Amino acid sequence: NATTFASVYAWNRKRISNCVADYSVIYNFAPFFAFKCYGVSPTKLNDLCF
Numbered sequence: 001n002a003t004t005f006a007s008v009y010a011w012n013r014k015r016i017s018n019c020v021a022d023y024s025v026i027y028n029f030a031p032f033f034a035f036k037c038y039g040v041s042p043t044k045l046n047d048l049c050f
Contacts, residue, residue, distance in 0.1 A: 001029060021050055 006012055023045045035042060 021045070 037045075040048065
């Protein structure tokens with residue numbers, strides 16, 4: 001949730017580390033269209049180390 005995101009020409013990158021990756025606040029932002037994680041299960045993000 002920001003002012004305006006860039007297009008695929010200048011897609012910005014934001015790295016996050018050294019913090020407890022809590023993915024529970026993501027579901028409380030807006031109704032999503034496709035929550036398909038192709039690498040891990042959606043209920044397994046808080047059980048693995050990143």
